Amino acid sequence: DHNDSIRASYMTIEELHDAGAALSRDGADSLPGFMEFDFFERHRENEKEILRVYRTTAVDAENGATITPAAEWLLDNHYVIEEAIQEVRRDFPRKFYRQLPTMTVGGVTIPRVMALGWLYVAHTHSTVSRENMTALVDGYQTSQTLQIGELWALPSIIRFVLIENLRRISIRVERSRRMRQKANEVVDEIIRLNDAEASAALLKQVDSLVDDPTFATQFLYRLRNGSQTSGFAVAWLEERLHAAGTDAENVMMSEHNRLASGNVTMGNIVKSLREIDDTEWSVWFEEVSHIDKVLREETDYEILDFGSRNTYRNTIELLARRSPRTEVEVARAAVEMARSDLPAGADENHRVNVGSVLVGQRRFELEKALGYRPLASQHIVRSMRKFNWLAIAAPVLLITAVAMLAVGWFLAKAGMPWYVVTAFLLMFALPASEGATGLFNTLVTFFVKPFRLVGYEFKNGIPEDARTLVAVPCMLTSRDSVDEMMRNIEVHYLANPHGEIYFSLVSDWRDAPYEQSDEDLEILDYAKRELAALNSRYAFDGKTRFYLLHRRRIYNSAEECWMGWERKRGKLHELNMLLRGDKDTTFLGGSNIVPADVKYVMTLDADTRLMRDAVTKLVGKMHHPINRPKIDPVSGRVVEGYGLLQPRVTPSLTTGKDASVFQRVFSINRGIDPYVFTVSDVYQDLTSEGTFTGKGLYDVDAFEAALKGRIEENSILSHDLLEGSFARCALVTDVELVEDFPTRYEVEVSRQHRWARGDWQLLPFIIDRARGVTAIGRWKMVDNLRRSLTPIAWFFASILGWYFMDPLGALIWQILLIFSLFVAPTLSLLSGLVPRSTDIVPQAHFFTIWSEIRATNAQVALRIVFIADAACMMTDAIVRSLYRLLVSHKQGSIVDYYRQMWHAPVVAMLGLLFAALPGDNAFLIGIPFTLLWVLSPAVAWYVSQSAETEDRLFVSEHVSFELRKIARRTWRYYEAFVTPQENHLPPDNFQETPEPIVASRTSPTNIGVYLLSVISARQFGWISFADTLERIENTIQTVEKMEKHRGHLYNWYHTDTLQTLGPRYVSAVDSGNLAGHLIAVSSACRDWAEAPSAHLQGNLDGIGDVAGILRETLKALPDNRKTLRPLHRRLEERIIGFSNALASVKREHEFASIRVINLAVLARDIQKLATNVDHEVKSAQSAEVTRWAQLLVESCEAHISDSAIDLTNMEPLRQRLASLRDRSRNLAFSMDFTFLYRKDRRLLSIGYRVESKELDEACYDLLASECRLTSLFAIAKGDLPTEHWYRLGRQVVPIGAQGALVSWSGSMFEYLMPPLVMQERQGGILNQTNNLIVKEQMNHGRRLGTPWGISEAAFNARDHNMNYQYTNFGVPTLGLKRGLGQNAVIAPYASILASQYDPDGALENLDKLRKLGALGQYGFHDAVDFTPTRVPDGKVCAVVYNYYAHHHGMSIAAVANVAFDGVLRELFHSDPVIEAAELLLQEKAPREVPVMSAGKEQADLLRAEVRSIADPAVRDREVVFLSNGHYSTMLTSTGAGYSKWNGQAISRWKADPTDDRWGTFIFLRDTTNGQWWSATAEPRVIEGEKTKTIFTDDKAEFHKTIGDLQSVVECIVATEHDAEGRRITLLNVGSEDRYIEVTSYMEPVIASEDDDNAHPLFSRMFVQTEIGRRGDVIRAWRNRRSQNEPGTVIAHLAADNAGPSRPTEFETDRAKFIGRGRSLREAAAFDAGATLSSSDGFTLDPILSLRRTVRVPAGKKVSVIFWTIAAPSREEVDKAIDRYRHPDAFAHELVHAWTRTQVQMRHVGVTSQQAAAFQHLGRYLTYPDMHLRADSETLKTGLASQRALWPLAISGDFPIFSLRINDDMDMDIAREALSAHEYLRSRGVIFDLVIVNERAASYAQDMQHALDHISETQRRINPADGRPHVFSVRRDLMDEETWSALLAASRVVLHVRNGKIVDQINRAVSLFAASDAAQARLPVPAFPVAEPVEDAGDLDFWNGFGGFAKNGQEYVVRLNGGQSTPHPWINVISNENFGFHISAEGAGFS
Structure with missing residues (x-):
């Protein structure tokens, strides 16, 4: 337990508490490890050493070296460590580390948090848990407080300590492994020399590395327990270890610990790193902090949303740092002052509003009272805020002025008589103004931090007293868009259903000179009925959530005719009146009902899409008392608070299926960016007042008052800024509204014209200082005016520049003008490139610069080429808007554009002609610009064309034709293997070589993909409408009869009984896939039922596809018989004529129904001819022609049957469709994903088990998987919180110049499974990931040479009950798995899946695969195997003969998406529930992704072993065992051997080591x-x-x-x-x-x-x-x-x-x-x-x-x-x-x-190399060559008899392979020994496996228990084998004599610690290898034949050989050389207790 790690034993709980308490009062002393170091250098060294020993272990291990389990945690799991290296050094900039107070333990200045974290890791053996952390924290805080910022740093400090510990342990284990191999080499060299003269020298050489205990441990285990052993080196080692007082048992015991401690500590470190990455450090900080113990009571701190709470803490910490007060007392003072504020509120009656003192209006009062010293940044920000709008005007004006002076001085060298100066300066001001604005914005966003509002967290939904309604302004000048507008309404509702929010609707029928023609009453009634149906469908607890409002139209004047008092502004003002109570409105009876009071109103629009729970945040921010408007009674301008909240608007990626080139030019940023939370704005951070753009929440009363008191008339489109001015708008920049952009250029011109009209209708509001206008509003209007006048300014500047002077040096002036426009975007481009002045050094974060540089170049080019047109439009707009209110007047082609605008070319020509005559020195610069300017319509047409995003692929016609033919060929599986036998479900797979057997199991995924494929097939035009309904109805009825557990299914099922195979295991993936496919099915049924009038005729292309397949099948006919080719050519002309007839039908547009009859007649003729051919030709291939002709005439009959619908009484079919849609939707939504949710680590469980009712153990943590689809469905349904989507995945592997995502075993069934239903747009991460992985798969295929398409498939390896198995595959680059580069199996369906992003390459790959044997009857096969271990003889490939069901489903679905422009993706996204969460995908890719750590490809694949022997006679004998289970034989290298059959032998053979000449x-x-x-x-x-x-x-x-x-x-x-x-x-x-x-x-x-x-x-x-x-x-x-x-x-x-x-x-x-x-x-x-x-x-x-x-x-x-x-x-x-x-x-x-033989070697867990090693062991086991036996001294003093029978071992038919086990943490060599015994038993070798335990009586009982458990798999009674030959003896139980007898009697003895099996056997062959060479080539010396024998006298009965020697006392036998007697003529000469007999020619026996 020493190692080099940090060990301090256990501490448990209730000891950590007072441990920390003692540390707080009297700590320091010392720490377990710990030394004087610098943080940053130590972290860099840790990263370097960990990388060193990760690459070392990677390049080793795979070389064929035994790897310790400690190093497994470093190889298999390295990615967690690589993110753990980050975060640290990312959460610790230099300034932040220097803020932590130091503790100074032992004279080393160490921050207090570092020491507190060192004790936690030391006393818990690197096991991190939340409760222990809390116990330690509060125990430490019993006396000493932890400041905010310290308490945040504990997880990162813990990560640092853990990574240091892991570095120490990894270095030590790597060094120990190297020492172990050095010891093996040295002891092998000692044993290779028999003499002791060189052993002493070698030991003297090695003496420098003997002190380390990891060296002498193997040395002794390899010398004491060996074959030739030692006795000079062992004595030397014993003497050395007995010197210095170490002995040998101490070193023996040390390795039982250390090694085990190393393994346990590495495992604990990995678990703790994972757990720290898993838990959420927000609730922990909320509970363990003392400062929240103050605010969680007596004030409204616990419900303020996380961001506002964090801002409160940040303000408190900033106040406490720069002041003589600490955190607790500053929080107390803030609470006291907020109390002294007095509540004065309606709802704010209890609690305390502490916000009006930290970030509220009284922040300065407490700041001054507490002696806070402001920063220079705070001082300058406050000064700029105090200088109001002048702080934004002055710098821009100064920059413009310096530009004026620079350009004037540098360009005053050519005439320019003091009048040209003013004109040029005033015209150049506007581009200079834009440049100044960009510079000011960049400086502000780089220096001033963004400003965030404070709001509530409505965790239970919007309450009463905050009732809101969403009033989308809409128009009813349409016929069928009412359904679209309703759908928008359900989507808006589903964005946030919870709360007291309503969704109204306001409408009008455009303008008309009359009042009301009573012609749209039907439209109104239809809308009202639809909305009534909507309310009935969505109404819970008696609540009407949807309302319709309409206005009667009142005559005002011309133009607008009759549209009420005003435009949409008048509509909103009337709505404001009607909400607060007003009966004399201008609305319609029956549509003038509004929800009672309603305090806040959100406007929104038709195309602006809301985010999930995006309005609850705005309602809370408006409702919080800090942000509530106050309304000054002096003037209605809303001094403090806010009247309108305007959220920021984010452009969407693509407009559905339209993505123009125009879209990718004038919208650089596209999609949502989840990493950023707030965006720095220049106006809001300085003036605290933004701009209103017509979309945002507002208070009703304040807005109504401030607007009814100010505006009189004259509002068309510029109102929004006016209300933003009178009220006080704000940009939250936290909630974002995704908006679309117009793809065509026609819309943008109109929009710019409308903005220009609005901005130029408000001149008196700026010119006059009277009325009421905010100071900032006027500046905003001036900014809008200058931005509107920039184009005309550039135009006039350029024209006058090349006209007036007309000089030779106008090129510098022109390039200056172009440089301004190039520069203006580039500041924003560079703003996100500076690494904050190179603070820290991150990983390879890429550049990704060229893309946006090209985008900006394109933007500038389009601008420079559209200046003329834009300027002319803006001129006409300005003159119109001036003549009004001053004079008080009150789809196409290039030709279409050219006749529409027609102003830019003529104006450019006029200017060029006017400026070409004078001067005669400006044509060289005037020609190019006018040339590009007149070729304007072509550019507009080119940019207005919609490009290809991912669906509208350029597939021409032949590629789509081939793909459709492939799909029709692979649909034969579903045509054949679906039968109404209570089945209606596709079987899983289908074998065909070991007799065709059809499986009887089905998963939910198979059902879902089959139903999707049925829909796709009906879309293609293969089956009639009635057939589709029948198949779907049958499948859905069978599914409803299916067994369920809270909605879900039980994964595997039976196809005939509908029962479950094994345990009822609910799977999360399969349920999600089936539900996602059922939603698409329901949407398809809805679309089919909404108009069953034109959706019946069909496509009439399936009949073309089957005809093409028949034509292609015909070519595979070797028609070379006696008749030559009469019928072949007859049928070929028939089929080409049939194709001509079908084409003639197709070009006809009326679609005459009588032509299908002629087509059917031709089909009958072709079928008859094919049958006639088959009657005379019985080839097995002509059956295919027969089947395809029959299918052709089925297709003709199906289209005829479709063409016979009455189409008058279409009601029963419509009722059936509606019921089917309802049942499908209810079946999909009935699935409950609640109980699977792990609310501890978020994520989801793998599945549920109905036995013992427990969730599964693992979870899903990768973005690129099918869990993506499952989580999207669960989020949309509303059974998971949104954060689950952002919790999982997001890892980037750099390939080429960019980075894709990352996945477990990065195949393509999981990157490209969701896009079959889900939609991926142009700018998102997902599609570029798909493109990159397709390119990477192509690269892998070309570098291997074999065709690409690696994915999950059945590979060529069978088993008992042969079924080809099934496993996962992938590419090594994208996998995070060790073992993905050893298989290289290709599956055809991956190519079809990859065709949605590259159809051409997919078709080429499929064409290459078809030239192999990989195309059966039912479409493509499953896989082709290229691994050399699974390829026979000299064949290059290995086809697998399987047809999996969901593989074919995916193939058909992908072909349907490609050919028909992605119909399946559109079906899934039409459902309102899925459309609400569709906006979640987006996710603009960040262009700053970190790069992970990294003819070899063809070498890493698994290769078989072929043992080749050069000269068998003069080398050691090698044998091989071949058996089929019953007939076992052996063959030595020289050809000798035997043969056995069920035990009894066949060919006589004896084990004679010297002779070895037995057998056949x-x-x-x-x-x-x-x-x-x-x-x-x-x-x-x-x-x-x-x-x-x-x-x-x-x-x-x-x-x-x-x-x-x-x-x-x-x-x-x-x-x-x-x-x-x-x-x-x-x-x-x-x-x-x-x-x-x-x-x-x-x-x-x-x-x-x-x-x-x-x-x-x-x-x-x-x-x-x-x-x-x-x-x-x-x-x-x-x-x-x-x-x-x-x-x-x-x-x-x-x-x-x-x-x-x-x-x-x-x-x-x-x-x-x-x-x-x-x-x-x-x-x-x-x-x-x-x-x-x-x-x-x-x-x-x-x-x-x-x-x-x-x-x-x-x-x-x-x-x-x-x-x-x-x-x-x-x-x-x-x-x-x-x-x-x-x-x-x-x-x-x-x-x-x-x-x-492959099946036999797979049924037992053996590898070919293991097979070779086991055959070497069998060689050593059968022949008496004993070279792996015990020592000579261990055998001389041992090997007694009448023993080994007390251990119940026969030892008669038993070579006895022993295996001494004294390690007890490996326990793996025992499994290898058992597997070898089983394999050799299967091969026909009989022996005993004795597993000898050599332990004390401490853990022996557990060892024998585990041994019995692991060996009971073969210790049971094996029929005809009778007790099986497996033993586990106990050394302690038996005496020493029996143990010695057992060890001596075993033919081969291997120890378990000193090597590993298949590594000791192979090494024993090399050490025992290497005079007998000249005697092998001599053959033999022929034979001898002598000349009979002379029959002499002196013999009585002289036969041919010998006779009596007279007196009968002797029998002389005379022979020559070589001759012999007919049989041995022996003579027994014996006595009472001995004897011998000797033959006549020479023999002997005794």
């Missing part, structure tokens, strides 16, 4: 030459033989090269037939024919191994072999002895190939094959004769051998495949022999072998 073999003898050799590399091997063995999975391929004749063999076990296949392949290169013959040899036995090795004579006797007809197969079995023998007949099949028929020979007698005295190396069957006399029957020595002489040509190859079949019954091999007698038969088996 293939011998090749040349006939002409006579030399014979082996196809393997062991029995014969002759000179040459560049041999090579390649072991892998499946196959064991043996190579050989003998003198220009190659011969490669392949040995594989078959599938589902229990056979083993050996294939030989002879390659000839030279130009000659070789005549060789292939021999097979295998000795059979059918017994359970032990019975075979016991008495070989029984086994060899009881075997009958025979051969039957067609003699290429030999059958053998055992004769029936007892009724308990399985029998198990076997056979050996020759299975020839590549040649004619030749006779073969067989031999089943080993006496006549080996030869009675020889061995297999020198067998007698390969002599120069005696060729296999073919003895058969009950041979006493049975073998199986087959020989076929082949003839290899010169250059070609032959092949012979020997099969070894084993079957239970005799009649079963015939079903296997005939399956293998056929030719080929080796392909089509290979693929099953690969699939089954």
Whole structure:
């Protein structure tokens, strides 16, 4: 527990309290870690070291090194750390750190908060929790107070301490890992040298790094528990550790802690950082602060909204800092003075208004009373405010004047006789004035902070006494816009439903010379009925929320005719009268009802869209007593308070589906910016009075009085500024109203004309000082006038400039004028670029400058080219507005624009002609400007054209045609796999290769996407109207019958029973997706029912698409039969004629219904011809032509059926549609998202579990996901607060020159799922993220080379019950997951999804994919796998044969959005609930995003292991195990091995390490030459033989090269037939024919191994072999002895190939094959004769051998495949022999072998490298080569017998793999050992896994409990395996002798601490690798044959071999060399207790 971290044990609670209390009174002393440092340098060093060891661990670990669990928390979770590095150093500027009071512990000046935070982390082991923090805080505050600003800094200080701790721990663990690998290397070098002469030198070298305990810990574990061990180095280490008093057990125990403490502390640090990032530090500060204990009582502080409370605290803190008073007493004094204020209020009867003293009107009084010293900034701001409007006028005037003098002095060198001076100065003033205004605005916004109002927080809605109504002024000069205006009203209501707010409506029927023609009464009645329906639909607790008001129109004069006393101003004034009680109004009876009193009225407009809860903030700000108007009785000008509140207006991104080039030029800022809260304004921060623009809340009484007392008449459009002047308006700049902008230039001209008219109708208000006008109002009017006169001023200045002087140096003057206009925007551009004078150093925040530079250049260009037109319009406007009130008079093309304006070109030509004649030196500068000015109409037309945003894509016609054909091809899935079998629901997927099986499960997502696809299909024109209604009704009825839990569904379901598969798990994602799709369905049904009169004819393009698909299907027909192509060309001409007929129908516009009959006739003809073709051609591809013809004629019939609607009695269908819409909407809204809401960390739960009724554990925290759609729906429904949307996501990864979003496993099913329903506009973050990720996916695809489109899909990997599995994928750049760059799987549907942003590239990618095998019947397949570990043989790709349902749904929906201009996005957004929250998306991207930390792509993909062995004879033996579960075999590198079948063996084999020449073999003898050799590399091997063995999975391929004749063999076990296949392949290169013959040899036995090795004579006797007809197969079995023998007949099949028929020979007698005295190396069957006399029957020595002489040509190859079949019954091999007698038969088996071995390796959690390691372990386990066993001294003093049976271990059929476990935090090596045991059991290796525990009696009980729990998965009774061979012994329970016996008796012993499995086995092979090389190539010395034997005398019975030596006392046997007796003639020579017998030629036994 030491490490280098900060450990101070536990403290729990009630000890932290008094700990902090002691720290406050008598603290200091010391701290656990802690040292003298500087904050900033230490933080930078922390970041540097953490980056160092993050990159080090990244470049390691993946290299194949074991990684500690402590380092996992640093690799897998690094992003939380990277934001934790920020915030700190972002929340601590230099000036703020120096404000914290210092504590000075131990002579080190440390701020008090730092020390208080050091104790919290130390005493809690870096575990942060809210309650412990509160306990520590209040315990510390028992005596000493914490100032505001300190109490804010605790979370950041805690983050700093945590990151310091993590840095220390990470450095230590990295160093320990490096020391561990150094120790491994050093001890390996020691063990590699046997001599002790160099070991001492190496230890002396390493002595510098032995003191550290992380080094000697592995050294001892690798030397004490090893194979060759030590005894010189161990003694040296023991001596060193015993010196200096350390011993060795102390170091042994130290690593049990430290390491575990490191892991625990890293985990705690990660959890605490996450928790600090999770909780909200507003309620915590509200509760733990003492200053809020003062204000939460006795004053209205607890309900003032967060911003106002924060401003109060800031003012209090500022007062306390710059004054001799502290915070508590200053708050007390403020409370006392506010009390002394006396309430004097209606509602303000209780509590205390403390606001009128901090930010109110009496702030200066307390400020002066308390001795506050103001800042210089405050002094200058107060002075400027005191100088009223002069403070804004003086600097602008001074800047203009200095511009005048500069330009006058620099340009007075050419005549200019004192009169040109005045004209040029006055004309240049206006651009100079704009420049001065921009400069002043920039200075003010850079220096003066913005000003915020104070208001209530109506958390329960707007109360009584604050009743408001929203009165949108509207017009009724329309027919069907009433529905639109109503919809606007529901949206406005849904923006904030809670409260006492009403939504009225005021209307009029434009102007008319008459009074009332009684012609719009029907319009009025329709509107009233609609509004009555609206009130009935929305009325809770008996409240009428909607009202309609109308005005009767009164004659005033001409022009306006009859529109009442005045315009909209008169309407508002009449409304003000009628609200307060006035009966003699000008309104209509029946529409003059208003909600009683109503105190505040909001105006709003038709297109201005409100934000959520945007009016409650304004009502509160107006209602608060500080902001209430007072109305001076001296004059009605509203001295203090405010009369009107005008919120700021934010332009929207795009105007729905219209986004002109004009929009992206004259509105630079677009969309909402969530980061900014207030915007600095120049007028409001200095004069405290803004401008009213006609939209904003106002008090009724004050406004009514101040306006009825002042204005007489003459108000048209300039009124708003006038009311803002008489009353006192204000800009809140906190609540914002999103407004649209006109895309065309026609509207802007009208708007500018109206503004000019208004501004120029108010001249006497400025000229006259009488009447009533505020001082600031006049200046505002003058500013408006100068801004209006700028264009004409620029015009006149330019024309007179190039006319009067006409000089040669007018270029400098012109560029000066252009420079002014360029400069004016650039100040605002640069205002947000300065980093506050380089205070701190952030991360790579990008630049993003070129974009707005180009935008400003375009803006200046459009301005400079429209000056002429704008000036002319402004001239006519000014002269009109002057002649009035002075004289008191009272869609198109370029040609359309040119005839409309027609003034700019003619005026420019007039000026150019007038100024071209005089001077003759200004044409060079006059020509270009006039040239651009006359080409004005073209620019206006170009900018008025609507561009492509995201829907209106330029897809031409062929691309959309191909996409529609793909969609129609993939809709076959829904056409086929949806049946009315109580199903009406799509199945999940569909297998087709392992026999087509259809799934029976369905999720809500599948239902939603299927319904959306049905709507899209009806939109395309594929099915009739009745079919769509039937399908939707059936699906909705089935869904209503479905089981539900508070509205939601249970994720998985059954398709036939409608029951749940497993636990009823409610999923948040699926419910949200289904509800979002149901809303779109309801909207579609509404749209279809609102007009079922023209929505029936259809598109008549589905019939075109199916015809095109048929034409494309026809081309895939190899029509080359005897008839050539008569019918093919006939049907081709028929189909082209049909397409011509359809086109002829289509160009016709009347849509005659009789032509569809002709189309149907042609369809019938084509179908008949296709059927005729199919009757004679039975190809499997022509069925597709048949099906597509049938579908074509179904489409024709469907359109005919649609064309037969009566269209008179359309009522029943309308009723059905209305009921269906209502049911869909109710089903969607019934879902309740309340209980899933986690009100502790916000967010949402993953789902709900009906068992034990608990929420899930994780949450969703990323913006780019489907949780985006779910959260949007939940927010719109109103079941979550708005802040949840802003809480999640928003992370940026820089790709290219910009940055996209960030997602878990950044695939595309989650970036592009929501845009199927949701709308994304041009300027938002989401669409640019989509474009960037499409580009990045393209980059990934091209860098890998394979086609792009990575996403979630089924990859090529099956299992038990083969179903291809299913998992997530993505790109490594956008993923935040380790493992995304190792798969590289491509899914076709991702390309279709990506077509909504780039259809061309998607089509090209799909065309590339179609050239592969990735297009089945039901559209595209699911995925194509490119990972080399999951790709067979030499194939390059790997297609997956699946058809997932929602994948096809997404494909169809995306194609529908692309082709039909995004209909689905418009359906979802037409619902008022969704339209209310649509404005939430926006989110203008901030252009300052921080950048996160970072042929390798093709190398990171997973690669298989292929073990290649150069020369098997002279290298260590390697084996491979191949089995199909029942037939298990082994093959060594030299070719030896055995074969087993259900335990009992087949081929005789013995484990002889030196000989190793057992098993089956293939011998090749040349006939002409006579030399014979082996196809393997062991029995014969002759000179040459560049041999090579390649072991892998499946196959064991043996190579050989003998003198220009190659011969490669392949040995594989078959599938589902229990056979083993050996294939030989002879390659000839030279130009000659070789005549060789292939021999097979295998000795059979059918017994359970032990019975075979016991008495070989029984086994060899009881075997009958025979051969039957067609003699290429030999059958053998055992004769029936007892009724308990399985029998198990076997056979050996020759299975020839590549040649004619030749006779073969067989031999089943080993006496006549080996030869009675020889061995297999020198067998007698390969002599120069005696060729296999073919003895058969009950041979006493049975073998199986087959020989076929082949003839290899010169250059070609032959092949012979020997099969070894084993079957239970005799009649079963015939079903296997005939399956293998056929030719080929080796392909089509290979693929099953690969699939089954991959399934086996997947069913157990093993990897190919783990498979290789486990096969090495099996090699060490079966053969008696013991190189991983115990030490020599550990085996000499151990290995007793009659033991290991007390541990209930048989130890008879048990090699016993032990595994000593003494670590107890890893517990992972045990799982690897168990998995290896299971895998080797599956492969046919039997052994025991003894897990020895070596602990004391402290944690042994828990260790054995956990071991039993983790091993019970295989300790249970396994059928036919009988107790499974898994053990867990206890060292403490058994004595020492049994433990020693167990450790000595285990063949292979591995310790668990000193290495890891598959890392110790692989390292043991390298250390035991590397003289026997010259004896391998000599072959053998032929054979010996002597010349008989001479039959001499002196022998009685002289046979051919020997006879008696007379007297019968001896038997002399005489032999030559090499000869032998027929059998061993032995002689037993024994005694009572010993004996031996010796043969005649030499032997021995004893």
